[PDB]
Every structure is written in C-alpha cells, then in structure tokens.
Amino acid sequence: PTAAHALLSRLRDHGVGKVFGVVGREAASILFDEVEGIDFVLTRHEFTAGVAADVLARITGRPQACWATLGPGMTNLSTGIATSVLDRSPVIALAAQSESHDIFPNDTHQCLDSVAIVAPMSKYAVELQRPHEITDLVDSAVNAAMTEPVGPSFISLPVDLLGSSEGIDTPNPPANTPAKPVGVVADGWQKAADQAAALLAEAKHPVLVVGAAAIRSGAVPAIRALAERLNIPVITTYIAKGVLPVGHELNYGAVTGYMDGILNFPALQTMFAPVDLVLTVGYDYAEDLRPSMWQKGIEKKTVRISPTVNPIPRVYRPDVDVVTDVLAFVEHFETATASFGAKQRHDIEPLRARIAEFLADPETYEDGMRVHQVIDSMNTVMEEAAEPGEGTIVSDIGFFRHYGVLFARADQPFGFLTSAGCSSFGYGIPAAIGAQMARPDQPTFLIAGDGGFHSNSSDLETIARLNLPIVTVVVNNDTNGLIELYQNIGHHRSHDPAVKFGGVDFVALAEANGVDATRATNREELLAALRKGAELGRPFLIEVPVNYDFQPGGFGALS
Amino acid sequence: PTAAHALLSRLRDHGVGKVFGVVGREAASILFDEVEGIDFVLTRHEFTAGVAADVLARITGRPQACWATLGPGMTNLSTGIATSVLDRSPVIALAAQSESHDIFPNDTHQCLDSVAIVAPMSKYAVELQRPHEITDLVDSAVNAAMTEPVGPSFISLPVDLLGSSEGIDTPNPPANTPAKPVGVVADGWQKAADQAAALLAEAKHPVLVVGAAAIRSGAVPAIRALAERLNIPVITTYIAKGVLPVGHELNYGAVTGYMDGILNFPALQTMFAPVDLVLTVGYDYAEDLRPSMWQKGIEKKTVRISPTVNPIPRVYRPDVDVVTDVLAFVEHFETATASFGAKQRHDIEPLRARIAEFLADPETYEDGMRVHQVIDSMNTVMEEAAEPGEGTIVSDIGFFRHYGVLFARADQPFGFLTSAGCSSFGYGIPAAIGAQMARPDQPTFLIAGDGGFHSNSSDLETIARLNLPIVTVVVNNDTNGLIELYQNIGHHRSHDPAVKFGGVDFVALAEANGVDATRATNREELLAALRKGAELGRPFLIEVPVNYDFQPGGFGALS
Amino acid sequence: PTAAHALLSRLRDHGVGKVFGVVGREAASILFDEVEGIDFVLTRHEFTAGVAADVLARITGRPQACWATLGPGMTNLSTGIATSVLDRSPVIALAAQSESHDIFPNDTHQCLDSVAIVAPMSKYAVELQRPHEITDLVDSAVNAAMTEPVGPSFISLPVDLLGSSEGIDNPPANTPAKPVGVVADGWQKAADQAAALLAEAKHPVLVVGAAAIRSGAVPAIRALAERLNIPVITTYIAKGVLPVGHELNYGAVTGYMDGILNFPALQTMFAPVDLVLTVGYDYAEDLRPSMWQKGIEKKTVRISPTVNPIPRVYRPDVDVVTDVLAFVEHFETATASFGAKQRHDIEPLRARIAEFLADPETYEDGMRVHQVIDSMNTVMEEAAEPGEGTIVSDIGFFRHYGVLFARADQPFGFLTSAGCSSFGYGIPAAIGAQMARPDQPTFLIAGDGGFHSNSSDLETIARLNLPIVTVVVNNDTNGLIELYQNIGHHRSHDPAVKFGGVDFVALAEANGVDATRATNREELLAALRKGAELGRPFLIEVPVNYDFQPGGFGALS
Ligand SMILES: Cc1ncc(C[n+]2csc(CCOP(=O)(O)OP(=O)(O)O)c2C)c(N)n1
Ligand SMILES: Cc1ncc(C[n+]2csc(CCOP(=O)(O)OP(=O)(O)O)c2C)c(N)n1
Ligand SMILES: Cc1ncc(C[n+]2csc(CCOP(=O)(O)OP(=O)(O)O)c2C)c(N)n1
Ligand SMILES: [Mg+2]
Ligand SMILES: [Mg+2]
Ligand SMILES: [Mg+2]
C-alpha cells in the first residue's frame, strides 16, 4: 500500500472521481484501480486530458485532475496546464519523473526539469521526495489551485517514490476542500464600494460588464436582481454569456474586438458610446475584454471589482478599485443603492436588428454556408433539444469562434464555452468532453474550424469510446482562416504557404474513429443533421463547407 | 524592411531554407515571403514542426528552424524543443509573444512567460527587446545550439517588435556557421587516450560501443577502419545502427534494455559477458545504453570518449575519461595502436541465430501478425527499393520500437531513426517528413503503433500536401501496449481503462487525409502493400493488426 | 561516519586544504575536524570567505572552497559567489539548508530557495538529497567549475542529511590540472587567416587577458612578442605577463585613463595600430572594443577557449575558439618566417605616466593617490625578491590609479576584481594572495568607503597573523560615485556619497593590528618599510583628495 494509493485516495477526499490522462511507464507503480470511486479516462493526447479537467472544474466548481508520464508527457500536458492557468480552473496536474536517484535533467533518458518548466505557468509546482508526504502535497496543491485567480497546481512524481510504501501507515485528516474559491480582500473595500455607489448615483447611463469570476463567486442571481431593479444593462465576456437568459431586455450581449468587422456595423460604439460608468464585475484581463473596447464616445468613470489585487495598472486604472469577493460586493452595494431611482438605459436596438438579420440570413451561397447561418441553425436545434436553462455550445478557436461569441445561444452560465485566456486550437473536443460529463443529461454541441479541429481530431476516438453524445460541427474552408485575416490586416495580402491546407474529409475522418457523420451544405441539410445528431444517443459529426467573405476594413479594435 | 525580414534573412545566412511551424496572429508582422530561398512548411501541430526540424538538422548536420505563436503555440512546440534537447539537434526555435508593452504573463491574453518555460529545456533562451538586435540573437542561438551537447536555442518575439523597422538599416556581417559542432577538450586528453591504448593492448576482447555523437563528429569511416584492422566488434545505440553495413562481420548489433525480454534469451550476456574492455565512443546517457547493460560476466575496464565533461559520475565512472572530439580521438588512437596485433573476437552466434529466428518466423497467427514478421517484410522491400548505403526506416515510440532496434535494417548512419532521448509518441510522422526531405531520392518507411500514431495522426494531411512518398506501416493492437507491459511488470496484471482503445480504421483515416492506403494481415499481403507503396511516387499507408504475447518476467534489465 | 566526513574527504581528494567561512547551527552536523589536512578558516562575514577562496583559486590554478549557514548565510556568501562567476575562479561554494523534511522556502525559519537564488550566478547549483551522493555532487561541481569560463559551483546541504551516515560505506578524483575549454573545428584554419592578417599589418598589438594566464601561455606569448616585436597591452589583472621595464610592456587599459592622466592616452596607445589580437578575451574584464577603436578601423582576432558570448559588441574579423597556449604554438609555426615589425611610439604617454608617479608637490589637504602608489611600488621593489610580490587593490576611483601605476613583476602581481568589482574586496583578496604566496610581501590599497564596507575582517588578518600591509586612502567620500554625479549632472549631492570621519588607525588597533598615520611621501615610505619588515599585519591611513575633472571621462559610455 503505496504512495500511489495515498495519491488517489487524497484526490478522492477532495471529491475527484476522474483522472484524465495518458499513462506511461509509471504504470509499474500505479494501475489506477487502487481506490474505489476514481476512474482513469484515457485520452489520445495529454492536451485533451488537461483541458477536459479544466472544463469539468469550471462547471462543477470543484478541483479536478489530469495525468501524464515523464518528459514529453509533461510537456504535452503543459498546454492543458496553460489552458487552466490563463482561463482559471482548479486543476491538479500530475506527471511522472525519472527515478529519484536518477534525476539528471536533459541527460537521463526522458528526463526534463519538470518543476522549472511548469512553475511559471502554475499556482504551485513541486517534486515528491518522501513518499508519505504526497498527502500534504495534494493539500497544498488544492489550496493554491482554489485561491483566486484559480489555476493549476503541479506535482512531479518520481517513479520509485510513487511505488514506495515507505513511511505510509493504513487515519486520513479531514480534506476541507473550499466550496468556493479563496479570494483576496482589501481593508476598507466597503468604503470603495460606497464610492462606486456614489458614482452610480451621478451616472445617467451605467453598465455591468460581467466576467466569469462573478460566476465562481456565486453572484449571478444577485447581479441579475441588482440589474433589474436599477435598469442597468449587462454586458459579458465570452464565457459569462448566460448570466441573463436569452431574450432578457438587459442582456446587451457579449463583446469581442472582432465584432465591428464581423457585423460591418459600429457595434462597440453603439454598446458603449453614451455610457458614462462601467462597472467591471469580476474583472480579469485574461478574458480579453480590454479597456480599449469600452473606451468609446464620452469619457467614462470605471469601477473594478475583483477578488485579486489589480495586476495590470499600466492598462487599467479604475477610478474605484474594490478588492473583495464579488458576491460580498453585490450584497454591500445593494444596501448602499437601495434608495436609488432606476436608470434610463441606452438604446442598442440597431445592433440587435443587425445581429438578428445576420442570424436570419436566408441567402444560399455559391461557395459554402456562412458561419452565422451555421450558428443560427445550431441555436434552433439546441433550443428544441434542451430543457429551458440547459444545454452547452462549445467553440474551438478561430475566426468562426467570434461568430460564436456574438451569435451562439447561452441560456445558463457557461452555456457557451470557449477558451478566452489561452485560446489553444483543438480545445473543442476536450471541452465538449468535460462539458458533457458535467452535464450528463444535457445536449452538448461543438463548433470547430478545420485548422484547430484537425490539430486535435484524434480524440474523436475518445468521444466514441466514452459514448458521449456530443454533436460536432466542423466548419471547413481548408484554411487557418483567422491567420489569413491577420495576414491581410498587416500586409494587405495573403501568403498561402503559412495558412492553406489541402482537403480533409472530416466525415470520413469521424467514421474511422467510429463516430457517425454526414455532410451538410445548406440550412435544410444542416438542420436535419443537427436534429438527427441530437436524437441519436451517440456522438455525431457534421462537416460544413464555409467561406468568410472578409473585408480587412473594420478591425482596428484588435490593436 | 522589418525585423521579420532581418530574422528570415539571418536564418538564410546560416543555411536555412525551410521554417516548419504553425503561424498565429503574428502573421500581421510576418508573411514568410520576405526572403527569397526560405519557405514555410505549415504543419497541423507544432510538435510535428519541431521534430521535422530536429531530424532534418540531424541528417544535414546544419542548424534548422521551427516556429510557433504565443502561449499555447509555444507550449505545443516545446515537446519538439524537448525532442531536440534530449536527442541532440541544433534547432532554432522561434515563438511569437504579446506586444512588448503588454507582456504580463498569466494575465494578458495568451501571454505565458516563454523564456522561463523554455530555458530549462534549451541551450539558450531569450526575448527580443530591440528590433535590430534580432541578427545577433539568431547568431547567439546558432552558437549555443552548435556547441556540444548540441540542442535547441529559443527566441521569443513580441509581435510589435517583430513587425518594427526601428534601428534596422540595409550590410550583414559574415555568419561563420560552424560546419560541425564545437566541442570541449580537456587538457591532457592525449595522455588519457594513451592510457586507453595501453588497456587495449593488454585486453583479450574489447568492443566499441558507438553512440550518435560519433556520427556528428564525422568519425564513422575512421571507426570502421580501426575496427577492421584490430578485429574489434562494433555495438551501437538505437540511432548509430549502420555505422557498419548490414552483413559486416564486426556488426554485433544494437543494444536495448528490452532485448533479453523480447527475445527470451540472455542476449546482454552473450553480447558482453567475455568482454574485458568497453570503449564507449561518443557516449551519451540520454541514448539509454546504460552501464548496467554491459556489466555482464567478467569485470570490465571502461574508456569514455565524448566532447563533453561527464555529467553523470554517479552512474558512470570510466577508468579512462577522454574529453575531446571523437574524430580526433580516433586519429590519435590509430597512431598509438598502429603496430598492435589484431584480437580474437568473441562469439555471439547463439544471439545471431536467435535474432534470425524471429525474422524468419513463418507461423500464421490466429489474432494478427507479429512485429518481427512485420519488420522482416519492411527490411526485404527496403533492400529492394533502395540503393546500397541508402534508405531510412523511421520508428515511432512503443513496444514495437524496440523490435525495431533489434530487427530493422540500417545500411547507413541514421538508416534507422527513432527518438532515443526524449521518446515522445507521435514522433514518426514528423521524423519521416524530416528524413524524406533530407534524402529526397531515397525510400523512407515509417513504422508506428496505434497509440503513438493516433497521438499525432492529423499530420498525414501534411504528408499529402508536401507529396512526400513516405510508406507508413501502422501496427495496431488497440492498446498502448508498452504500458500494458509495465502494468504487468509492476502489478502482475492489466488495467484496461489506463491502456485500452476502441477500434480505429487507419486505412480510412489516411484516405480521409488524401493518402491512399490498404490493410495487410500477413506476410504476403504486407510484402505486396510495401512494394506498391515504394513504387507509387505518393505517400501510402498500410494497416497491420498485431499482437505481442509478452512475458512480463524477462524485463529485469529495465531497472 | 557521516556525509560531512565524505564531503570534507572529497574536498581533500581534490587538493583542498582550507575551507573559508562562517559556520551556523549546521555545526551540530559538521565540526570541521573530521579529516586531517583540511582546516577551517573563520571569517567575520561570508563575503570575505568567498572572495578569499576565489583569489586563492586564481593564484594556485586549483579549486578552492567556501562555507556558509542557511538563509542569510547563503545570501551573504552570494556576493563572494558573484565575485567568482564574474572574475572567473573555480570555487566550490557550500551552504547549509533547513532539514530536508522542513524545506518550505520563505515560511520555515531561515529557509530560502538557495538553488534558485544561486543558479543564475554559478556554473552548477544543486541540493543534496541522499547523503552518499555528496561525493558525486562534489565531483560534478569541480567539473563545471573547471570548465571555461571557470566559475563557482554551489551545493546546498540540508542539516539532517549533512549529519547522516545512511548509505555511506573512494574512486580517483581526476582534478583537471588546468581548465577544460571549448575548441571549434577549423580553428587551425582560422589561426592561419589570423597569421595572414599579421603579415599584411604594419602595427599589430597583443591585448592579453587573464585567460591566457590560466592556459599556462605566458612564456609562449612573451617569445612571440619578442621575436615579432609586437607590443603587449593587458586587462587589469594580466599586468605582469611581461616584467616591469620590458620594452614591449605597454601597460594596462582602463576607460578611466584619459580622464585621470588629462592626456589622450587611448589615442596614443591605439590610434596607429591596425591589427588587435585579443588573446584570452573576456568582456567581463572590462577592456571593451570601444577602448581600442581609436583612429583608423583596426582588424581584430579573438582567441578564447569559449564561443563568443557578445556578438552584439565584439564581431571579430577572425574568431579562434581554442585553448590559448595551443593557439600560440600553432601561430608560431605559421609565423616562423615572418620578419619583425615596426612598433609605434608611445613615449609621450610613458612620459606623462612617469611624471605622475614622480610628482614632488606637497598638497595642502593630504597626498594624491599617484604619490601613494609610487611610494608603494618603491617599497615593494625593495621588500620582494625579483619576479615576486603582490599589490592588491579594493574598488573605487583610486583603483584605476592602481591599474595604471602599480608595479606587477609576475602574473597576478596586481590583483583587483575586474568582473564583479564589489567594494570591500581588498582584505579577503590580500588574505588569499598572502596564503598562496606565504613568503612574498603582500600590500593592499583600499579607499575609505570600500575598506569600511568590509573592515571587520581586520581581526581575521590579525588572528591568522598574515603580514599584509594595508594603506587606506581616505577622502571621507565614495569618491568614484561623486565623479559619476558630476559626469551626469555637473554637480555633487553629498547625502549620497559623503561620510563623517573614521579613524582607521584606531580601527586597525581595535582589531589588534598595529597602525599609523602618514601625510606625505617621507612619512609614507617609513611606514611602508616598517610594515614590510614587521612580521605582523600593519595598516597606514593616508588622507587624500582627487580634484577630478568630470569632462575628461567620455570613454566610460
Ligand atoms: C496552439 C495554437 N497554435 C496556433 C494558433 C493560431 N490559431 C488560432 S485559431 C487557429 C485556427 C484557425 O483555423 P480554423 O480552426 O479553421 O478556424 P478559421 O479561422 O478558419 O475559422 C490558429 C491556427 C492557435 N490558436 N493555437
Ligand atoms: C508523449 C508521450 N506520452 C506518453 C508516452 C508513454 N508511451 C510511450 S509509447 C506509447 C505508445 C504505445 O502504444 P503504441 O504506439 O500502439 O505501441 P505499442 O506499445 O502498442 O506497440 C505511450 C503511451 C510516450 N512515450 N510519449
Ligand atoms: C558592493 C558595492 N556597492 C557599491 C559600489 C559602488 N562603489 C564602487 S567602489 C565604491 C567605493 C568608493 O569609495 P572609496 O572606496 O573610498 O574609493 P574612492 O572612490 O573614494 O577612491 C563604491 C561606493 C561598489 N563598487 N560595490
Ligand atoms: Mg478554417
Ligand atoms: Mg499499440
Ligand atoms: Mg573615498
């Protein structure tokens, strides 16, 4: 009864039921059957393991776990670790190491200096040295992972020590897993919150800009109630879509810096130009809603609320900085603003008409579908398939992803999932896995482009193996499309060798992994394929040819 | 006329004609058309890019180059960088970074502290800060990469700075690209080489254990002629197979720690038991030919020759350490042993008969073929399709790979290619891309297992796009088979969730990528498929079902 | 029979006979009497320890050892370690650490992440984990320390493991006799391209750095300079590769020399030169290309047992990566048939230097440093056998006087820190020099700022009874820093550079070191001569001033 047993056992004490990963030669020291209640989920690549853990942690609000072997196992896991550190999830990342007496980084076969490599991208990074201490190392790893900003903690596991029973006796101290993240609180945050209240009283047209940290804090209903009483519009980051239901009058949409260019419309100015006060509730620069995007029209005052000290004062100098828990802020703020008269909210109907018209685009095109037609079709079938307040749409990374930000339906928090911080291509499959496992009885759709999807398409076999009924839509234009956009922004022409592919048959690709698939080229075909996939009870994949029709004109918000 | 131009231009100055990678939003600062004579080679994943550069650099003996975007681009590339640092190749690894004024690691969108992450796995790692200095940074990278132990040098490139002309005026100074690696040389190595010559004189059965460093030094012809004259047997690491031709009487084969167990034979004993002196020529612990593998039978004396100070005295205390250039050691050694009488070489025919017995195995099995029969067939068609002294068989990582070490034909240096130091699965495809480009007119076969091959299978599309006529054999037992072996060694049983896959049709998978394919299930079908493949003028893939029937007991030498 | 025994024992196997340091609570695990032939040398501060080890290692060409306790011990040592890495010496730096099971950097009492802190300023840094491995850690440390650029290797020692016998039940040491270096393929060819440039050149020179001394290349370089009539210019510590008076000894360079001499000295030394061969080049020594780039563009040849670390600054026309001696030997063969050269004229500069050193004036306030060093040279020529003696200089403005004017009659006859240049360097460098040359005279000159930064080790000099003679030149100021205020801002600001008075005579005497005051040439010469024959340490304080000219130091940019 070994450090391997103690490791899995202590993960179980913190609520972990799954370890995602790829096991290497450390299998001699750990089978993964040591502890009842914890199953191994084998992936085809370690990146998929890390991201699935990241996403499962986001939705459940609980620490999750991933696994890799030494050397290149750990470097492959590192892109999932990076997904967790930038996107913010409590992930315990574990990787094997050469035998302790044989650790010579870059000399011993497969031996890298794992801790030096991972420390800069993690909350906590350590190497096991005495087997019995693994219990305290898991606890210190959970501790750091669950402190804002939440993130991954890394433990490197030399193979001999992982298989040793030395110092281990068969009375586990309580876990005390935080039920929500530990945050930082400044003295006199209440006073700063009052100052923010005084700005709100003076303001004629305020907004709440909500980030995901507001969801982790459990502040969604409270923010909604605040917004409704005072008639304050709510604008979101990519993943805070769904903090208000679809069709709510205060749901002013999500922001992407690509929105003016995509909609051929002055969207950011319509959203922000008349605004005189911006409250960034649960702000986090990594979500990529930057100050420059709301600095439109008149001068604005700002209020930052975050359970962290502001790491970017070069970029964001709020008039009022409130360092405290988000829910605690909203409760204090409700009391301070109880006497305030409801505001007159600014008009964004022209932007709403523009969005609705992109989604309703009834044209049939020569080359492919347009991505807005694809998402609108995905919305229709999601709403049919899902109970109200349920369903997840997931987006991989690419130009199409920003169409997801503007157009995809989100009827609950995390109802639209993508990687805002790290934005690694191929994120889609592992995210759809994590999401479907978190929400077992809910439809899970994935949209991905050909570039990013194929970067990580091999874990289609994992989707089949686990029998997760994810419906995937690959939008194909045989290009790294986002990158062709940037070629054009910077140089006013393309260069195909850096961005162009030959053909891939994603239908045939899906079928080789044992996933049923079909091609769809217009709304009618796409709708039928989605509805078949949703009702299939097995995963399903739909390939859709697309084109973008871009005009490098309106993309200045990207500077 | 920008730092992008100055970067690509200085790579062209050091001989580089290709840059492998994936390009992100830095495409706004760099098209990859700025410089005649350097082309971009787009992959589906950055790992592929870094490994192709590593192999192309190994075979050409000249610095090569790979490329990634910021954040996850850089971390994906790092498995390639780790390949380069552990296998020893001179790679210039390049990654974009957030705009210089906006570099806040783990806060700014996609911003990771790239230098801190890569420095522990590289020879040199730096961030560009003033545009015109990109010329001297490239040189300093080449400098550190071409010093032994050769390895990767990393440059992080903030997007603003890459695209800036500030400080750049177009007359470039001379490159002085080292023609072969700069190495370290101890004072008095001539004296230590004479002590080694005196030990050779007084020895009944010496051997030369030859590592890849000896090939890098250009020492192969010289080693051959010393071995021939004095009747000294030559034993090699995985990748130094072919330093003598196949059939040569002194070609005593390659060592792998897995050999007694695969062969069910005391192969290490037969190979080393009566040997009284081991000359490890170009020794490098990373190749995984460890002292404990030749420590069989009688007390041996050892002589280490390397162009590096000994990094692992805990594990290898040679009787004579000769720190110098390998070629210079051999020339001095010829001089001091010119009048010595030739030796009686020891008999290893029992081992040879056992290896030949595996290769000739004519049994049809109920389940699939056996990997030794798979490799025998590849040897036959490689000898047919390749000129003498030519051809490359490439191996991915897994249990099958060590069958490769024992059985695969290699008629020149690097005629058998696999990753000996880092051993990342998915290696095969990119190593074969690199091998095929370095040897445009030679046949290039790849063998990979299903675990490893599917880990990086998406880059079949790259093989089709570049039209490289690589013949790929996938050996499929629906298992991470090597890992199931380690489960059985450690625990005396399997655990399927950590190692077992569902069905993947690699024939259909390849064809979905634009590569023609076919299933072969016995020697007759395999030979027919391999013959077709080698004559197609197009890539081809062959799926072969296999099984291992392993014997967990005979792998003691792995500890 | 403990890891402590095994560590000391392996240090003895590598020639080490002294460990310099300060011992903390790790004394419970290590006494320093476990091995005959290795003694402990207690200092007052760990910096002194590290620097004494660095200087003993440079002069002896052999690895040396220093020691500190955990946390602040190790950080104190680190200025010593920084001295070794920048100045180039093979030092084994040893520090204790918290018990292995209690290592929580920045939470455990006195616990710092020692390896992370020292890795960036060392050749090798590691923490002990299993007691018996200390033997191989010591060997890997010596290996990395004795590879060019030579430098310090650090081993962190948790107290429990240090005092444990677990697994402890010896193989040969193989200490390199001289540094391991790198060597490019085609270096013989690049050295021939250099000989072709020496043939086509009218006024070549040899700029020599200390790495030529480590290579054992000094005799060989003399011969090549004599036969081909090439002048030899040096870095601060390569002074004395040619004897005093030798016609080819063109002295040492320092970017402060134009400004101090009030004379276009670099112009004189380098204007008409057309080929510069930087023999054993090392940018850390602070003789930079800008200092020889006077007049006509020169061609340059670099010769170092290392690849060029600084191509942004020094792009030689020819780069010869190889051992220095081996380069010289191969260059002799290629230049065997060459006729001697016409060496350009620098008498005007020699005359200005001599004129400084002879300065007979008597200044109201106190002496001038050029007069102090002249008096030092005179008494050192008397006291010391020929080819012998050591003048050590601490850091500050006066040190650049030391570079120009101080007598060096052997390699390392003038000692200062060229690379790291920490003030307080002087005492420990004089301690190490005196120990390496037990029967030679050892003089130290230091300023009041630097001397006082590390003056407490006067008691160590007394305790070890090393007959060093120290001259503290006191102007109640960090004078060098006042100069830089004036270069940058055209005025002074006293709160950043001025002290009140310190009586260094009384300070010395408080430490049990005899001392006296001296205010002119005659008082100074009597003090030095008394001190050189005292058979005990001795200190002399001399009031000085500088009256410097800010506008003449354009060369420092
Ligand atoms: C790991 C990684 N490398 C490079 C990039 C740059 N990049 C971002 S999304 C993307 C994919 C774009 O192509 P695709 O998935 O087809 O979407 P499209 O833009 O064509 O709609 C790429 C290459 C990235 N995001 N992640
Ligand atoms: C990047 C990476 N992760 C994990 C491993 C552990 N591992 C080594 S090879 C391998 C693949 C083994 O399966 P397969 O390629 O089919 O070869 P087989 O052993 O079945 O013959 C695995 C999972 C690895 N080598 N590299
Ligand atoms: C550790 C350290 N801190 C600060 C300095 C800057 N500095 C260099 S030498 C020196 C001393 C200058 O005064 P002093 O030793 O009296 O010599 P002076 O310039 O007066 O001749 C100082 C402060 C330094 N060299 N080293
Ligand atoms: Mg695309
Ligand atoms: Mg397999
Ligand atoms: Mg002073």
UniProtKB/Swiss-Prot annotation, chain C:
Its cofactor is Mg(2+); thiamine diphosphate. The keyword Coiled coil does not apply. Disulfide bonds: none annotated. SUPFAM superfamilies: DHS-like NAD/FAD-binding domain (SSF52467), Thiamin diphosphate-binding fold (THDP-binding) (SSF52518). Mg(2+) binds at residues 448, 475, 477. Keywords: Magnesium, Metal-binding, Thiamine pyrophosphate, Transferase. InterPro entries: DHS-like_NAD/FAD-binding_dom, THDP-binding, Thiamin_PyroP_enz_cen_dom, Thiamin_PyroP_enz_TPP-bd_dom, TPP-bd_CS, TPP_enz, TPP_enzyme_TPP-bd. The keyword Cell membrane does not apply. Substrate binds at residues 256, 286, 399-400, 556. It catalyses: D-glyceraldehyde 3-phosphate + L-arginine = N(2)-(2-carboxyethyl)-L-arginine + phosphate + H(+). GO terms for biological process: isoleucine biosynthetic process; L-valine biosynthetic process. Thiamine diphosphate binds at residues 395-398, 421-423, 449-450, 475-480, 546. One of its GO terms (molecular function) is N2-(2-carboxyethyl)arginine synthase activity. Homotetramer; dimer of dimers. Belongs to the TPP enzyme family. Involved in the biosynthesis of the beta-lactamase inhibitor, clavulanic acid. Catalyzes the thiamine diphosphate (ThDP) dependent condensation of D-glyceraldehyde-3-phosphate (D-G3P) with L-arginine to yield the beta-amino acid, N2-(2-carboxyethyl)arginine (CEA) via a beta-elimination resulting in the formation of an enol which undergoes a second elimination to generate the alpha,beta-unsaturated acryloyl-ThDP. This is N(2)-(2-carboxyethyl)arginine synthase.
